[PDB]
């Protein structure tokens, strides 16, 4: 069985890919499968500012490290890339420019810069955030499309529409779902439907006293009650405690493998993996901003897979 397992264990690559130079981090990655390779958004921040980039389509991860990097002209923070099967389309959803979170589209993501012009995907407001909506997800079932979002402030926030409403804006209405302290449920929450599990798998960044480290929680629906997986900083979903990585504390904001490139966020647990950003433990940063964050991946020990998958 690739049930998810109660407790994890990862293994780690090395850092992925340096930031070419006039760029100091990576972060924030989404992943989806493209024509066989791996198609990598994510933000980036020079020495003054966040943008968003792409990689080059790549093979295997090896390759990764000498992909292009390539900037997008008008700024996507924080993206989230899929393609929405009932309108054959992909989208790239992101925060901050012309609306709290905006939609673009296009017909091939690997034009960097040829998606179209940004369209409002939520224009709301929260209670007792210093940021105001952040790190959006976007996920749907058969009958509705999803927006999370977490605020820097200890809350999960969702908001849904019919799925044949989709795009349009959300509009300004949030339930919080969870709440937490601030550390507990700060950051990146992303969800995911669990291929052959017949469940929903969702992840959240907290602060932890080591590191940056996720925890995991699962649901029966994307409109029901989420509990808590694996929710310790000491037995986490992943961070310093299981992940293998001997260069970074932190494991932060990015994606688990997506098994299919759709807007049900699927993955595969047989395959489990995590894209994440992470940063030399051996150095203490300038400011967070200047951070060093740089892209990993954590693949889950013990897979009957694990030969095929680590291979490529
Ligand atoms: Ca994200």
Redesign the pocket.
Known sequence: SCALPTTYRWTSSAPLAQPKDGWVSLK?F?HVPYNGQHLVYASYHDSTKYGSMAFSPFKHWADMATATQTGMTQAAV?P?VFYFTPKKLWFLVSQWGSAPFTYRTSTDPTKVNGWSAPQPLFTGKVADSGTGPI?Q?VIADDRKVYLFFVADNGKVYRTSMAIGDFPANFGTASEVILSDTQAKLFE?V?VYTVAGQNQYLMIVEAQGTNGRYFRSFTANSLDGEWKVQAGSESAPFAGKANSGASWTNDVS?G?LIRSNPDQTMTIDPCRLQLLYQGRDKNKVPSSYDLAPYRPGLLTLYGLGLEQKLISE
């Open positions: 924030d989404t924080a989230t790190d997800t990146a992303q904001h994606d």
